[PDB]
Coordinates of C-alpha atoms and ligand atoms in Angstrom, one line a residue:
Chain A
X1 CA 0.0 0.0 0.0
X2 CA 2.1 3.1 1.3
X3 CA 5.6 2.5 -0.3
X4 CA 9.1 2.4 1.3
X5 CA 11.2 5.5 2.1
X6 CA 14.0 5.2 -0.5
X7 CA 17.7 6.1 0.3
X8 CA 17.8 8.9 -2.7
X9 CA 20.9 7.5 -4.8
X10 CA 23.7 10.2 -5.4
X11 CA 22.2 11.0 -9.2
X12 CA 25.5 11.6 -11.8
X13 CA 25.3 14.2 -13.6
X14 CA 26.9 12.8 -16.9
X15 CA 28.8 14.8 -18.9
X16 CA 27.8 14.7 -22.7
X17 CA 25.7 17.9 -23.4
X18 CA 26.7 20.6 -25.8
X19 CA 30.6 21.7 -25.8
X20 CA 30.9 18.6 -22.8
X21 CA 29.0 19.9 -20.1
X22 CA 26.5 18.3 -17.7
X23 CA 23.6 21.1 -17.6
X24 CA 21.2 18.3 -20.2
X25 CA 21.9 20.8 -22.9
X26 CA 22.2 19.5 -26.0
X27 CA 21.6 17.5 -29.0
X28 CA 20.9 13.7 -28.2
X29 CA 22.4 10.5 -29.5
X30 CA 19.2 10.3 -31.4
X31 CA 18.9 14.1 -32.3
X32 CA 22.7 12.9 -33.8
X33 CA 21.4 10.1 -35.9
X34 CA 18.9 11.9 -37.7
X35 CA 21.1 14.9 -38.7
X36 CA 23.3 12.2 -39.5
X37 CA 21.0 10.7 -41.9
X38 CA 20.2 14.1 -43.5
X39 CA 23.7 14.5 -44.1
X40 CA 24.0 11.1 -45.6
X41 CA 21.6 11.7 -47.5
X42 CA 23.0 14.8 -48.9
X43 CA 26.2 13.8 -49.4
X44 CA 25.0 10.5 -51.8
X45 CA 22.5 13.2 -54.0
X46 CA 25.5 15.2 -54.1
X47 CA 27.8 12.5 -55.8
X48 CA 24.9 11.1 -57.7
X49 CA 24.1 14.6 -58.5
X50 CA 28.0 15.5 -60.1
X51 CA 27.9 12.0 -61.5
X52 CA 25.0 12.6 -63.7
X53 CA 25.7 16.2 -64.5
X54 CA 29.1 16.8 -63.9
X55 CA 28.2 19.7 -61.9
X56 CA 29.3 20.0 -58.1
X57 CA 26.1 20.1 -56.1
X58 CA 27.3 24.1 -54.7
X59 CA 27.3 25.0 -58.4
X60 CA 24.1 23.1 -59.2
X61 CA 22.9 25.1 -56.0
X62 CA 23.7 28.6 -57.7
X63 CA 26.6 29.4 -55.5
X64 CA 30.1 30.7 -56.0
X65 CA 33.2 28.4 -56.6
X66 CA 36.6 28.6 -56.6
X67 CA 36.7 31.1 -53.9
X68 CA 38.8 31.7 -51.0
X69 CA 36.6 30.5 -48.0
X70 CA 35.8 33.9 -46.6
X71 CA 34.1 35.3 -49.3
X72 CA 31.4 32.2 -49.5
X73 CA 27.8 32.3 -48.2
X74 CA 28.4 32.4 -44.4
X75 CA 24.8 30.5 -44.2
X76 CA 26.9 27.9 -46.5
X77 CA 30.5 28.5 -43.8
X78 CA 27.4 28.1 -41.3
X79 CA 26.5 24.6 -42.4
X80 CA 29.7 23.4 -42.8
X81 CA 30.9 24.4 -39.1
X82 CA 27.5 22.8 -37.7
X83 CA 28.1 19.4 -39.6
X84 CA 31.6 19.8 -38.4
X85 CA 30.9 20.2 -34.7
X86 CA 27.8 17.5 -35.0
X87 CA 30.6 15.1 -36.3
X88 CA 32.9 15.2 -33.1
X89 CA 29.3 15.3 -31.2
X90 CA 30.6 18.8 -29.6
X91 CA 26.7 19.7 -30.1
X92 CA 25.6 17.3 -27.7
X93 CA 26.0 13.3 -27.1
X94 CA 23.6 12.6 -24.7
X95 CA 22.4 9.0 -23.8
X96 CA 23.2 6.1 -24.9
X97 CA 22.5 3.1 -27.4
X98 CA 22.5 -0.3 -26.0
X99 CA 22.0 -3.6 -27.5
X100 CA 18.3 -4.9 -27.4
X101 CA 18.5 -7.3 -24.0
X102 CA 17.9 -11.0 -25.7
X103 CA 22.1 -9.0 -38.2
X104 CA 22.9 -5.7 -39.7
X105 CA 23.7 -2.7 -38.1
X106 CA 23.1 -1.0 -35.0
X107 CA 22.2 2.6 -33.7
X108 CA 25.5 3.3 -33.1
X109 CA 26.6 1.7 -36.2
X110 CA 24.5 3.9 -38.3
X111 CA 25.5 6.8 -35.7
X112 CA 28.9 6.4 -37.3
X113 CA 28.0 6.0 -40.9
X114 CA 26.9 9.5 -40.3
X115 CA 29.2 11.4 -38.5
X116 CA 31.6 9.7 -41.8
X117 CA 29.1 10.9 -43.6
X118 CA 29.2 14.0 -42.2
X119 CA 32.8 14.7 -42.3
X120 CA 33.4 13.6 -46.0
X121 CA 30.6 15.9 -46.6
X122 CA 32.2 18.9 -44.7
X123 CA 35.4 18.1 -46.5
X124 CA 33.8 18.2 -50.0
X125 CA 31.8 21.4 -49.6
X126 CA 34.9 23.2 -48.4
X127 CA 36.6 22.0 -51.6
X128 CA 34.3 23.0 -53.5
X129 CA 34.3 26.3 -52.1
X130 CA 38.0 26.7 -53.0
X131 CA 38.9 24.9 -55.8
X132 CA 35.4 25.1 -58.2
X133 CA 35.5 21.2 -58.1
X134 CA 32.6 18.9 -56.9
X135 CA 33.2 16.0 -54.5
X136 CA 33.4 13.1 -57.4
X137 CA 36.3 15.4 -59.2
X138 CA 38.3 15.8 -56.2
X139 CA 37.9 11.9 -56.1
X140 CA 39.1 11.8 -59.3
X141 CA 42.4 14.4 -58.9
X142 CA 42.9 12.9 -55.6
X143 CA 42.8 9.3 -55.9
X144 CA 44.6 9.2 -59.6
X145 CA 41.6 7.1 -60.4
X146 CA 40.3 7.7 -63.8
X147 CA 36.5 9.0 -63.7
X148 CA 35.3 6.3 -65.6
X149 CA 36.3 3.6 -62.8
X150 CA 36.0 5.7 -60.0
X151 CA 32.2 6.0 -61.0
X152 CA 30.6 2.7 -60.1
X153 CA 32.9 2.4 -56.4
X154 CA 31.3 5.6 -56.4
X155 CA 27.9 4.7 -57.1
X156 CA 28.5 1.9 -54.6
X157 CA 28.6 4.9 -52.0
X158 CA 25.5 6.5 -52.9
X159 CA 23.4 3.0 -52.6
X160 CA 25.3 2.4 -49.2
X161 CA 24.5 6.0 -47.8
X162 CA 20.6 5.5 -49.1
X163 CA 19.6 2.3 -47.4
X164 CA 21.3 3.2 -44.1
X165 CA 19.5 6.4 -44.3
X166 CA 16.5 4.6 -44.0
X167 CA 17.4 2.0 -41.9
X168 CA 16.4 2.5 -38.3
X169 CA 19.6 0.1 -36.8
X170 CA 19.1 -2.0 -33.9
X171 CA 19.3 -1.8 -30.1
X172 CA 17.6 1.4 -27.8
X173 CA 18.3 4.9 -27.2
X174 CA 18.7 5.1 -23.6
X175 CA 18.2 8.4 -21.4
X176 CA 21.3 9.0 -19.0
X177 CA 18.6 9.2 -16.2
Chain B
X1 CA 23.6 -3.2 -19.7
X2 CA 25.5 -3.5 -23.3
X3 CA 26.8 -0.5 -24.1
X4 CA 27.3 0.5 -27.7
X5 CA 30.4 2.9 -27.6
X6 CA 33.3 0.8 -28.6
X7 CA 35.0 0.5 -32.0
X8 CA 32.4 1.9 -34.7
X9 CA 29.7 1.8 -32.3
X10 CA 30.4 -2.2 -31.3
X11 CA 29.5 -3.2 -27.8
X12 CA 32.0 -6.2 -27.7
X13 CA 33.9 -3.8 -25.1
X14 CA 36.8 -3.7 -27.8
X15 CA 38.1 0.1 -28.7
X16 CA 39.5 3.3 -26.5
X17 CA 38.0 4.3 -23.8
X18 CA 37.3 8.0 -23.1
X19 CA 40.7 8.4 -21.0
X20 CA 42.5 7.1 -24.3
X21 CA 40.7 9.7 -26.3
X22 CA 41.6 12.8 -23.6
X23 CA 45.6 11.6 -24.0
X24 CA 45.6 11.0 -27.8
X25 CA 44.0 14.4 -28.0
X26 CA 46.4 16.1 -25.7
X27 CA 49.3 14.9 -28.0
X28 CA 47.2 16.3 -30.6
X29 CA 47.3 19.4 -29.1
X30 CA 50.8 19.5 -28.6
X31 CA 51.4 18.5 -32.5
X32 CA 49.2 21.1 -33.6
X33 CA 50.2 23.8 -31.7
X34 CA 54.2 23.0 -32.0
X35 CA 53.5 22.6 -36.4
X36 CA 52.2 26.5 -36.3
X37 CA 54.7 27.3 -34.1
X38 CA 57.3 25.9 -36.1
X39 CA 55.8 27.5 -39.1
X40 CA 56.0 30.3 -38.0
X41 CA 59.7 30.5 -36.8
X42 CA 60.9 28.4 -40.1
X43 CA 58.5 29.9 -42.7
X44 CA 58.1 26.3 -43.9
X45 CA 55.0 23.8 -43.0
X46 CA 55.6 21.1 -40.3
X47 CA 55.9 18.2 -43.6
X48 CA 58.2 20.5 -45.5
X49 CA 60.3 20.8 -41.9
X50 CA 59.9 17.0 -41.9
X51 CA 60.9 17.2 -45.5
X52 CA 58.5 14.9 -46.4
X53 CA 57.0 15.8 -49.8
X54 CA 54.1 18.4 -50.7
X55 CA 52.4 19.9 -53.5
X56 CA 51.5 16.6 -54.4
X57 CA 47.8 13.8 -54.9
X58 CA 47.3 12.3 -51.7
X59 CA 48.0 9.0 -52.9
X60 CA 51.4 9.7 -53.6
X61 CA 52.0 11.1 -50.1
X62 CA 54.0 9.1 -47.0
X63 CA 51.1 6.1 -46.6
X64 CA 52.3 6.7 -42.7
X65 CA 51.3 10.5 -43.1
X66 CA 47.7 8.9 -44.3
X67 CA 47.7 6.5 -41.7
X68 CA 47.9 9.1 -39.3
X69 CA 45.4 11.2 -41.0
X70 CA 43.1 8.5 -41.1
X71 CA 43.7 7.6 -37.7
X72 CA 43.2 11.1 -36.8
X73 CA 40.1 11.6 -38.2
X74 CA 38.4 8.4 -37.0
X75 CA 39.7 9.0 -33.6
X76 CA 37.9 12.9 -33.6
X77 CA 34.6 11.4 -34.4
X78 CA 35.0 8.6 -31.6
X79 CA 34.9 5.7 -34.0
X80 CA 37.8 4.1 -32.5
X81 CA 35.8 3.9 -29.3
X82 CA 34.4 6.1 -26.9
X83 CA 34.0 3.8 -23.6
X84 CA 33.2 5.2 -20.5
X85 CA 31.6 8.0 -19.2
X86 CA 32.7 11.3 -18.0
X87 CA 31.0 12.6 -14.7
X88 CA 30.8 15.8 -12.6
X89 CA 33.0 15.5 -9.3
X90 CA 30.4 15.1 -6.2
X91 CA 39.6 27.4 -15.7
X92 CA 36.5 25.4 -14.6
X93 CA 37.6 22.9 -17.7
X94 CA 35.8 19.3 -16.7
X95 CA 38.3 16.4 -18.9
X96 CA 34.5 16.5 -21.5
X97 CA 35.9 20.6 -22.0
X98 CA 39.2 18.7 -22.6
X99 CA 38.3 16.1 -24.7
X100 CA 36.2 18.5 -27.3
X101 CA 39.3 20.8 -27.2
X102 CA 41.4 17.8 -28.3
X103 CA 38.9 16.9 -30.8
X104 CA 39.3 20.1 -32.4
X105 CA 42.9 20.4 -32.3
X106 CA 42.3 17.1 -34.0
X107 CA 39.9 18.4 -36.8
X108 CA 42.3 20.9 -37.6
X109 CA 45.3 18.8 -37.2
X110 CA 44.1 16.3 -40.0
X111 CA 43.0 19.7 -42.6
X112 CA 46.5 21.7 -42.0
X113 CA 48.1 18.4 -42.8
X114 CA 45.6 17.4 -45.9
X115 CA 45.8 21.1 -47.1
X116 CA 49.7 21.2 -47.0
X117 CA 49.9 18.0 -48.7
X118 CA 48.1 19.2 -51.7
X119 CA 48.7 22.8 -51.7
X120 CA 52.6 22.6 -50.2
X121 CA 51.6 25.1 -48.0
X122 CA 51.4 25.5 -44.3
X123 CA 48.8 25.7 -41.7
X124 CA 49.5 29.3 -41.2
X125 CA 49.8 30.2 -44.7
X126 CA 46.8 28.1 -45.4
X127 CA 45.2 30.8 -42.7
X128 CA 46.6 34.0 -44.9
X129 CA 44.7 33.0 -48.2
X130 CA 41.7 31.6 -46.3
X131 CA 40.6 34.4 -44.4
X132 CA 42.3 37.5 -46.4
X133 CA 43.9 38.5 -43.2
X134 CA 47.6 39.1 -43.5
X135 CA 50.2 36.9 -42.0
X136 CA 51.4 39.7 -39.8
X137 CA 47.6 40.1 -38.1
X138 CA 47.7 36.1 -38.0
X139 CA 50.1 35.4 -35.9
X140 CA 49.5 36.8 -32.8
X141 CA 45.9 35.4 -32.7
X142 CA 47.8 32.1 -34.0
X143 CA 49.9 32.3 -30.7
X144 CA 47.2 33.2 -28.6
X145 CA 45.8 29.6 -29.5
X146 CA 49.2 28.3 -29.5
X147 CA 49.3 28.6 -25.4
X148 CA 45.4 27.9 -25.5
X149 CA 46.1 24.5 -27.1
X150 CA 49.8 24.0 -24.5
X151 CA 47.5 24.9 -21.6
X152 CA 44.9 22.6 -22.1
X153 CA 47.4 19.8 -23.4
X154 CA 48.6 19.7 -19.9
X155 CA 45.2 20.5 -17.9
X156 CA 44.1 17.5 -15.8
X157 CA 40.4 19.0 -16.3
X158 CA 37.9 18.2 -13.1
X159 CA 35.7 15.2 -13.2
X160 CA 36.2 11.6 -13.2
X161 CA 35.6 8.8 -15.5
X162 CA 33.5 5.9 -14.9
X163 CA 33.2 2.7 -16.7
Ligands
LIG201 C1 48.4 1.8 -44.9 C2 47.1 1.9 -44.6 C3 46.3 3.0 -45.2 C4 45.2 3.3 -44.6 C5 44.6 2.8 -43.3 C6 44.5 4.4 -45.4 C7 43.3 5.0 -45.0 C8 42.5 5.8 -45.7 N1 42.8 6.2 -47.0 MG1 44.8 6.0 -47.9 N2 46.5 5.2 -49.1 C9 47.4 4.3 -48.7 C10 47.5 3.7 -47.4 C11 46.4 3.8 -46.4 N3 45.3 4.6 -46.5 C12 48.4 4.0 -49.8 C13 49.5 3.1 -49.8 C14 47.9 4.8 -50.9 C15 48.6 4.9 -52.3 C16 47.8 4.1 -53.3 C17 46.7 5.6 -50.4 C18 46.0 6.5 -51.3 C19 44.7 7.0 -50.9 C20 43.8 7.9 -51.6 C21 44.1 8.5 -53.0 C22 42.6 8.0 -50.8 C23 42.8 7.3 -49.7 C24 41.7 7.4 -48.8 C25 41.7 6.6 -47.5 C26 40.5 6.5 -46.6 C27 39.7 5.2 -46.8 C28 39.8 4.6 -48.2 C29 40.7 3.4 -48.2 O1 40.8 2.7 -47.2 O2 41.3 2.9 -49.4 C30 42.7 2.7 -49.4 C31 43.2 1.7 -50.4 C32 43.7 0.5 -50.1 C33 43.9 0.2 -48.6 C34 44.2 -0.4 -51.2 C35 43.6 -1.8 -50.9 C36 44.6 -2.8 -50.2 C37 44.7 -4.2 -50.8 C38 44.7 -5.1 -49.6 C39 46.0 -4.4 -51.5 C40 46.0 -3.8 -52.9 C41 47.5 -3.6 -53.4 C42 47.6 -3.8 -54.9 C43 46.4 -3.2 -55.6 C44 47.7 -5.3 -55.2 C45 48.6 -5.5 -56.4 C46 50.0 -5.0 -56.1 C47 50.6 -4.3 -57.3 C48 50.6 -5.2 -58.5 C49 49.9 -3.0 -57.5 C50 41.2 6.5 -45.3 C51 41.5 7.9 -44.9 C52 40.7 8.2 -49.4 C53 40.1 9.3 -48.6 O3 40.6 10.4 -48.4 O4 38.8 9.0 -47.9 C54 37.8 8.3 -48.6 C55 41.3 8.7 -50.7 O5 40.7 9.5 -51.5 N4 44.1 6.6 -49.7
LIG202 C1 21.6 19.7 -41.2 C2 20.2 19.2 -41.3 C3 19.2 19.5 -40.1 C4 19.4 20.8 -39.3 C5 18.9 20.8 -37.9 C6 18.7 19.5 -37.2 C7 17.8 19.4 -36.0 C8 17.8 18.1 -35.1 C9 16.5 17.6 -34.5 O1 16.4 16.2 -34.6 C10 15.2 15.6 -34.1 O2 15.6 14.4 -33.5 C11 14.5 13.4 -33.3 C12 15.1 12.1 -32.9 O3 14.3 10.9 -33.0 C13 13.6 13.2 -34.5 O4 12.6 12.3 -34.2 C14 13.1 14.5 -34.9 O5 12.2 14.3 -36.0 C15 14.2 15.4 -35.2 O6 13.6 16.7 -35.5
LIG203 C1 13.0 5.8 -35.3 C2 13.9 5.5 -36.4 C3 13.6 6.2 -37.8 C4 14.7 6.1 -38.9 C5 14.3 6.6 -40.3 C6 13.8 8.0 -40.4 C7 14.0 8.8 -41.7 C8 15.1 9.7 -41.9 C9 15.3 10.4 -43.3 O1 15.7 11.7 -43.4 C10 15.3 12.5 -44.4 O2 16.3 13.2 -45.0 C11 15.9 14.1 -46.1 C12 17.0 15.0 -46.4 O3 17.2 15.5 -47.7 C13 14.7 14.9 -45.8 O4 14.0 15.3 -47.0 C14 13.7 14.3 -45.0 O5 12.8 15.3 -44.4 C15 14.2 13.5 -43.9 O6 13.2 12.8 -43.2
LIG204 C1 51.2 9.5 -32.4 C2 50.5 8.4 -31.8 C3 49.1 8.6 -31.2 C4 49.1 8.8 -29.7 C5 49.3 7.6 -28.8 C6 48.1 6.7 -28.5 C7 48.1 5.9 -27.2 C8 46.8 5.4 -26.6 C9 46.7 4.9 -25.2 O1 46.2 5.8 -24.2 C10 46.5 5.6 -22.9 O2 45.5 6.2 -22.1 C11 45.8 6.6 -20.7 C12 44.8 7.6 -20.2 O3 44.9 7.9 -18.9 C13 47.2 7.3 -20.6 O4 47.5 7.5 -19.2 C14 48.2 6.4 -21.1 O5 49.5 7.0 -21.0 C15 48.0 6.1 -22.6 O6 48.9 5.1 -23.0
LIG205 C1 58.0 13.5 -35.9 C2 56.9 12.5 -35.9 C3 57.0 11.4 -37.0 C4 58.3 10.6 -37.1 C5 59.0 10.6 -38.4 C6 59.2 11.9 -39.1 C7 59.3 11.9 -40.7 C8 60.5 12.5 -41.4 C9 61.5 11.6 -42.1 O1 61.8 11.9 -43.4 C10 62.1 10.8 -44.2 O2 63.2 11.1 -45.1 C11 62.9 11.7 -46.4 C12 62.6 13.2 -46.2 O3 61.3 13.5 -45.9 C13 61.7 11.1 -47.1 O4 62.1 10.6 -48.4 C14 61.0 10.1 -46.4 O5 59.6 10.1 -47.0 C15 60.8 10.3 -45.0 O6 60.4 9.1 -44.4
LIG206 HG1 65.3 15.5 -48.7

């Protein structure tokens, strides 16, 4: 009927919010995953996009290339620095994913797909900015690759990035609380 | 009970903890710091001072330089493991503070290095045609981070870590 006094356990405050700290400010592992996706997703339509086109997406997008990086769209400078930060989970890491208590990936699994994602998207974008040369060129230049057998390891990429976009991964978010 | 924060997100309990991470990234503090530094007292980019070769495809660059690059990289975005948890004691830096500072000193590490491989050009002169601003107004803001990045390298940071 009434219920026990409890001994109130010393709560941890854990420290994984935005920038590190413990004040539960911040994005979430999930929050991560999801912007994680998006950039995943963007990062495939972009290759997919200069592999049909031959266009970097920035140009395809209308904006200037082959720039120095502080004349670009700071909205554009903005982006890049928030999928940046969201990579190294400096915007917040809180929770965590843990197996389902009982074959493909997990949340965490797909967490990292996207902050890879993420990164190589960041890295492209900033290329473009200063050299006028979408992410599948720089491929090209950087690898030695020729275009024409770069293109299906590329288009490999851009079916990977899709179906773990959509795929949900296994195992629970888990509140730190 | 199975945590998912080991090596790309495994839970086998395999990958660095969080205490690796902090060190690794305090060396990557130190490396950073000490290639500007060196820049600017030699005029020459930290792989130039190594002599190793620049203005060159990265797949014709040191495969140890891309190793370390790679390793880097992985190692900023915690998919080499992340085990652990850091927790508030029951300036002001907690080791979390130290371990994003070390993940940005590891960000920018792994660009200088990329950047001077293909460009042959330095982190600070990387900095001069990035931003517009003149070497000479660089430098001292370039210092200023300089003893940011020593200063935190050797900061214990309050908090503890918990398995
Ligand atoms: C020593 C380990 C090593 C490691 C861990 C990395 C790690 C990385 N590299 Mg670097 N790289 C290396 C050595 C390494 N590299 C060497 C020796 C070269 C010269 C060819 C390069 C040239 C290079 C380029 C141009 C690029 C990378 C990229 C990458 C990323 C992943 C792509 C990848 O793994 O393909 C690496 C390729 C291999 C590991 C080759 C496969 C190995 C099989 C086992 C042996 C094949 C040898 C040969 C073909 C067999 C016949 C021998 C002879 C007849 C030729 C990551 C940053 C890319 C990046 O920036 O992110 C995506 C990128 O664009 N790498
Ligand atoms: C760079 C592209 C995106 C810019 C801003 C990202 C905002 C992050 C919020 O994420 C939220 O996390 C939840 C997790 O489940 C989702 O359910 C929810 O729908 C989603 O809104
Ligand atoms: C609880 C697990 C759910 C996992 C799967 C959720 C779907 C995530 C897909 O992201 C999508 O990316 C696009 C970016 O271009 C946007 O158009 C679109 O709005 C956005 O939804
Ligand atoms: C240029 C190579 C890259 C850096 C070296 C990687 C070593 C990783 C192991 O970390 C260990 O974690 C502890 C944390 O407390 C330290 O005390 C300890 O000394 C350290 O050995
Ligand atoms: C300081 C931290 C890392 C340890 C080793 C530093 C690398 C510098 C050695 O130069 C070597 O001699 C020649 C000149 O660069 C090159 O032909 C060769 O590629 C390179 O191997
Ligand atoms: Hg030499």
């Amino acid at each position: 009927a009434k219920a026990p006094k409890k001994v109130e356990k010393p709560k941890l405050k854990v420290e994984d919010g935005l920038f590190g700290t413990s004040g539960g400010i911040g994005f979430t592992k999930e929050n991560e995953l999801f912007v994680g996706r998006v950039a995943m997703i963007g990062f495939a339509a972009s290759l997919l996009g200069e592999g049909i086109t031959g266009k970097g997406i920035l140009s395809q997008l209308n904006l200037e290339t082959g720039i120095p990086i502080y004349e670009a769209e700071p909205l554009l400078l903005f982006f890049i620095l928030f999928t940046l930060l969201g990579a190294i989970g400096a915007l917040g890491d809180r929770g965590r994913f843990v197996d389902e208590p009982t074959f493909g990936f997990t949340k965490s699994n797909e967490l990292f797909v996207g902050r890879l994602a993420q990164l190589g998207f960041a890295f492209s974008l900033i290329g473009e900015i200063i050299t006028g040369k979408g992410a599948l060129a720089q491929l090209n230049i950087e690898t030695g690759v020729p275009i024409n057998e770069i293109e299906p390891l590329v288009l490999l990429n851009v079916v990977f990035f899709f179906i773990a976009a959509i795929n949900p991964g296994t195992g629970k978010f888990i509140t730190d609380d």
